[PDB]
Every structure is written in structure tokens, then in C-alpha cells.
């Protein structure tokens, strides 16, 4: 009996006869399914997981510098040379500087100077593809007839894009089917899944291709090879034979600022949780018998345990306590503008409200859909029944 306090909840009216109910399931939203001779059921999408995502590109946002040397040549002696300027792990910068008799050349003029440093990545971010065929959907169900504390039988199912049909067994209520259709995973070909320090987002595909950081476009090899490492290393203040190397420091906070307004998603562990939904489902519930119609009406008296409360959608929720070993028995519940007797005016959300326990002071909750204006919630039979006024809109 989830979906009571949910703000984004849809009330779908079915068709009397054929087992037809077409629902649209989101994250954070749910639906109350009401059939003709069948119990009202809540259906919500709670978990979207994506497994075994393939890496696409990794960016380095914190670098380190290592064994660094320079090489200088006198004027007319050509351009400076280091053996490690031929190394894929080294960043090098060549420049011209004033040489003379004081630093060690036989001529006065401009000499060549090169400086190299070894690049190493301390911390990196990784982008992955999702490929909708490895998604997994987890759906939660529950029926009505329960009590307030029991918020938190009730079933759960798993759905795959290529295994979209599912059936769950709900105690004495029977079974319900679901034949579903996803639509909005990457929407098509876009939306990489990014992993930073220990949290994860879903980024635009083109935006990720343009991050100005060192990067290697594989999954991993022995000692990766960083492209465009020149973006995090600065050379400055060349003297005559030594050029100082600077590393720009962590760019983590920089991408957080560029990640303001992106869609986040947790992950624990190695399976990706998602906060986006939008899968449509055709539910067939012809094999869903009610629960018990062979009960009798409860003869004893009721009492309001909580003030009946209005939900976000105008529906009224009521909990009563039943004193008597009469149970199990049907609860008499109805509506408005009497001065008995006594025409039902609204409609219930709970199909067949029942008392479940025999003895002696059991609790039970139900939900109504009241008519506009003034109305009277009446629970109980004949005399010693309990009534509560209600006003809609």
C-alpha cells in the first residue's frame, strides 16, 4: 500500500471486462490501478540498474611530475635535444634564450633550449557507454486492505528490454502480468555514464568529448598513454639552462562547476543505479481474484483512531479500530449528503475494505475519493456507527 503519500501519483481507470490497463511508470511516481471486480493495486518503478558498461574515454584531473631535465645549445649549434623528447610519457617545451660568455658559449646570441618532464596521472575520471540491452528494471507491487503502520501480500518483479513480460504471485489474490516497453535509456546513442572521485553522473555525450583535460581513449593497457597532457603542465621562466615545470593542480572542482545541472546516479557496487525511468507497461490482471467476497458485514462498532487526512490529490484516507471477535468481516464504508437513507455518493479507492483479524481490537485503513462540496464519511452498520464530516475543494 505504497503510493499513498507520493506526490506524483496517477489514478488510472481500467475497462470493465477485458483485462486492460495501460500505465506509464516513472521514478518517484506511481500509479493506483483500479479494476472492476479486482483489488486496487499500486505499481511503482523503484530501481533502474545498468550492468557491464563499456569504457569510452578517461580524463585525468590530477597529474604529477617526475624526472625532469633540460638541454641547451649554443648559438649556431642547432636545436636542443633530449632523448626523452621521443617518449610518449614526456611533455617537452623548446625555447630560445640569450647565451653568452657568462653562461658558457663562445658566441653571443640566441641558443636553443628544451625541457622535458615525465607525466603521471594521480586521479582520473572515466566515461562509459550504457547500451540499453544491459539495463534491469525492478518493479514493486502492493494491494489495499492494510493498516497505517503496515505502510513500512506484496510482490516485486524484474524486467529486461528483451524479457519484458513478468508475473508475480500475490498470496490469495492470485497473479498479475506485465508486458512492458522501455524508451528513454540513452534516448538514442547519447548520455555517457561518468565516474569521478567516488560519485557518478550521466553526462551529455558531446559535452564529454570536449573536456579540456589529458585523456586516453581506451579501457586500460599496461601503462596508459595520455593524450594532450600539455593541458595540465606549464613551463615558465627559462633562464639559460633550466626551465621550471608547473602542474596545474586538481581540476575536480572545475568539472563539478561544469556538472551543475547534470543528472546524478549512485553506484554500489559496479552496478549502476539510475534515477530516470519512463517505461510503458500493459498490465493484464484477469487472473486476479479479489480476496474474499464470502465475508459478512462487521456487526460491532468502529472508532476513528486518526483524524481522516486529505492526500495531495483530494482523496481521503481513514483508519478505524474494530472492537469485536466478529472478524474477518467486510467494513461498511460509504459517503455523502444524507439525512439517511442513504445514497452512496462518491467512490472508494480501496476495493472491498475488510477486517483481517478475529479478536479483538484490530486496526485497518482505507482510502476514499469524496465528491465535491460537503460530504459525510460513514463507517459502520445501522446504529452505533461513526460519522465524520468532509469538505472537498
Amino acid at each position, epitope marked *: 500500500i505504497r503510493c499513498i503519500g507520493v506526490s506524483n501519483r496517477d489514478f488510472v481507470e481500467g475497462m470493465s471486462g477485458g483485462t486492460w490497463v495501460d500505465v506509464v511508470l516513472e521514478h518517484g511516481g506511481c500509479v493506483t490501478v483500479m479494476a472492476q471486480d479486482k483489488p486496487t493495486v499500486d505499481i511503482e518503478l523503484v530501481t533502474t540498474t545498468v550492468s557491464n558498461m563499456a569504457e569510452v574515454r578517461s580524463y585525468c584531473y590530477e597529474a604529477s611530475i617526475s*624526472d625532469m*631535465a633540460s*638541454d641547451s645549445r649554443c648559438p649556431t*649549434q*642547432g*636545436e636542443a*635535444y*633530449l*632523448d*626523452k*623528447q*621521443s*617518449d*610518449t*610519457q*614526456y611533455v617537452c617545451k623548446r625555447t630560445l634564450v640569450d647565451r653568452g660568455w657568462g653562461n658558457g658559449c663562445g658566441l653571443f646570441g640566441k641558443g636553443s633550449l628544451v625541457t*622535458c618532464a615525465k607525466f603521471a596521472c594521480s586521479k582520473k575520471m572515466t566515461g562509459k557507454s550504457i547500451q540499453p540491452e544491459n539495463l534491469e528494471y525492478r518493479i514493486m507491487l502492493s494491494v489495499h486492505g492494510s493498516q497505517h503502520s503496515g505502510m513500512i501480500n506484496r510482490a516485486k518483479v524484474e524486467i529486461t528490454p528483451n524479457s519484458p513480460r513478468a508475473e508475480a504471485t500475490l498470496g490469495g489474490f492470485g497473479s498479475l502480468g506485465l508486458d512492458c516497453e522501455p524508451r528513454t535509456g540513452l534516448d538514442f546513442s547519447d548520455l555517457y555514464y561518468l565516474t569521478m572521485n567516488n560519485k557518478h553522473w550521466l553526462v551529455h555525450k558531446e559535452w564529454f568529448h570536449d573536456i579540456p583535460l589529458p585523456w586516453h581513449a581506451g579501457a586500460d593497457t599496461g*601503462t596508459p598513454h595520455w593524450n594532450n597532457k600539455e593541458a595540465l603542465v606549464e613551463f615558465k621562466d627559462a633562464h639559460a639552462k633550466r626551465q621550471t615545470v608547473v602542474v596545474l593542480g586538481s581540476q575536480e572542482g572545475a568539472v563539478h562547476t561544469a556538472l551543475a545541472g547534470a543528472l546524478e546516479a549512485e553506484m554500489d557496487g559496479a552496478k549502476g543505479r539510475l534515477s530516470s525511468g519512463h517505461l510503458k507497461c500493459r498490465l493484464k490482471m484477469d487472473k486476479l481474484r479479489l480476496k474474499g467476497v464470502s465475508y459478512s458485514l462487521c456487526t460491532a462498532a468502529f472508532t476513528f483512531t486518526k483524524i481522516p487526512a486529505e492526500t495531495l490529490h483530494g482523496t481521503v484516507t481513514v483508519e478505524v479500530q474494530y472492537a469485536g471477535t466478529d472478524g474477518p468481516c467486510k467494513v461498511p464504508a460509504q459517503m455523502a449528503v444524507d439525512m439517511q437513507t442513504l445514497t452512496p455518493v462518491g467512490r472508494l479507492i480501496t476495493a472491498n475494505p475488510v477486517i483481517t483479524e478475529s479478536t479483538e481490537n484490530s486496526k485497518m485503513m482505507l482510502e476514499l475519493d469524496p465528491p465535491f462540496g460537503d460530504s459525510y464519511i460513514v463507517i459502520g452498520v445501522g446504529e452505533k456507527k461513526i460519522t465524520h464530516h468532509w469538505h472537498r475543494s
Partner: antibody, heavy 126, light 116 residues
Framework: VQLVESGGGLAKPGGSLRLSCAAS????????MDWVRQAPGKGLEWVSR????????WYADSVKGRFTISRENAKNTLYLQMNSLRAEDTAVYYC????????????????????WGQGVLVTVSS | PVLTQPPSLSASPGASARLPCTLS?????????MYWYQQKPGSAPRLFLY?????????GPGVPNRVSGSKETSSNTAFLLISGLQPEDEADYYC??????????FGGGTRLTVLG
């Protein structure tokens, strides 16, 4: 992966020889080549160098203007045209293959001499 | 640029042989890729060791695991280390580096003599 040299022999000062280096077992067009020589009972001296395409050659000073390095990748052969030999050119000449690189830069930037040929003896004397 | 090597070096059997190679005044051992070759009588040289640092090295094809290199920056000298010295290690060892100007410089070669 083997290298063999041909075209040794006895030349007179001012004559010419054509050393050849036959290579097999690797894509000969992806490798820089070198000729290294060694006089009888002496050290190693680098003679010339050639790129994998053939449009960039380097020469030791003691050889410039005389020797012509070249390569025809189709026949899988490196060449060393030796012109106007001097008595000091008498030595064994090996052809050596450098280490391969994926462009200009490589892993560790190593460019040492992978494999050496057997060597041809060149004697020049009147 | 020149590479100086002792013409002959003798080292006792089973011990280590530190074959040195001192670079000229205009080079720094710290930033050189040192290439070592082994040449036995009647046969062409073959790659013995690439050495730049203890975390950046490479054994030549078939060369045992008892060989390594080192550098002493204070004397501008590279060292070829051969431990577990067996008489099969008697040969000439040539150190070689590349430069953009002289284009390939070979040492004079050190003839190893395994005593005993």
C-alpha cells in the same frame, strides 16, 4: 627476422662497390636502417642512416660526399653505394635495424639497434 | 661528444663486473638512453642492455637476468653490471648513445676478462 649482406670484395682506391642488405621476417618499410663498420680488430663506427621511406639520410663526416645510402622497400633491400674508396674504408660493414616507433615518439623513446646483419668485408688497396 | 671506455677490464669469476662508460663534458648521463652491445669473436654485435634508469630498462634478446645498469651522475658515467660472472661472458662490450648532431656515438669497447 634475419638480415644478410652481399656485395663485398676488393676495390682499388677510387673505385666503387655496392653493398646490399637483404631483410626478411619484418615489414622492412616500417624501420630505420643503419650501416655500421668496424676495421679489423678495432671498434664500431657508425657510417650512415636512412628513414623507412628514404627521404631523410644522415652520414658520418668521414664519408660525406662519397657514400650513398638508399633503400628500395619493394625488393626488401637496403643499399650502400660506396664511391671513390680510400684505404681507411677497409672494414667489415654491418647493416643494423633500429627499434620501431609508432610515428615520431615511442614507448621509452628507445631507438637502439634491434638486429645486425652478418657483415661483409670490404678491402681497398692498390 | 665522445664515450670513454677502459680497453680491458678483468673481473673475478662468480663476482660482478662493473663495465664503465664515461660521457663527454657536453652530455648528462641522467638524461641519456644508454645502449649496450655485446660482441663475441667472429660474430656481429647484438643488443645487450637498454638502460636509462632502474625503473626504465630493457634486456636484450636472450640476455640473462643477472645483468643490469646504473649511472653515477657525479662522474658522468654509465655502468654495465654483470653479476654471476660466468666465463661465457667474455666478449667486447660497446656503449652507444644517440645525439641529434653527431648522430651515433660508440664507445671504444671494453674487452671483458673473466679471471680464474
Amino acid at each position: 627476422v634475419q638480415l644478410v649482406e652481399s656485395g663485398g670484395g676488393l676495390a682499388k682506391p677510387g673505385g666503387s662497390l655496392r653493398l646490399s642488405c637483404a631483410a626478411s621476417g619484418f615489414t622492412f618499410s616500417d624501420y630505420y636502417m643503419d650501416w655500421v663498420r668496424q676495421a679489423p680488430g678495432k671498434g664500431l663506427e657508425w657510417v650512415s642512416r636512412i628513414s623507412n621511406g628514404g627521404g631523410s639520410t644522415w652520414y658520418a663526416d668521414s664519408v660525406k660526399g662519397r657514400f650513398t645510402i638508399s633503400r628500395e622497400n619493394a625488393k626488401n633491400t637496403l643499399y650502400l653505394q660506396m664511391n671513390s674508396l680510400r684505404a681507411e674504408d677497409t672494414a667489415v660493414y654491418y647493416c643494423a635495424r633500429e627499434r620501431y616507433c609508432s610515428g615520431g615518439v615511442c614507448y621509452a623513446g628507445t631507438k637502439y639497434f634491434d638486429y645486425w646483419g652478418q657483415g661483409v668485408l670490404v678491402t681497398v688497396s692498390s | 661528444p665522445v664515450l670513454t671506455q677502459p680497453p680491458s677490464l678483468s673481473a673475478s669469476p662468480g663476482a660482478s663486473a662493473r663495465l664503465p662508460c664515461t660521457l663527454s663534458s657536453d652530455l648528462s648521463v641522467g638524461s641519456k638512453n644508454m645502449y649496450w652491445y655485446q660482441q663475441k669473436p667472429g660474430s656481429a654485435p647484438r643488443l645487450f642492455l637498454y638502460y636509462y634508469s632502474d625503473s626504465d630498462k630493457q634486456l636484450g634478446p636472450g640476455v640473462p637476468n643477472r645483468v643490469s645498469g646504473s649511472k653515477e651522475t657525479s662522474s658522468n658515467t654509465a655502468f654495465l653490471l654483470i653479476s654471476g660472472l660466468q666465463p661465457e661472458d667474455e666478449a667486447d662490450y660497446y656503449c652507444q648513445v644517440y645525439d641529434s648532431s653527431a648522430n651515433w656515438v660508440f664507445g671504444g669497447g671494453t674487452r671483458l676478462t673473466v679471471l680464474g
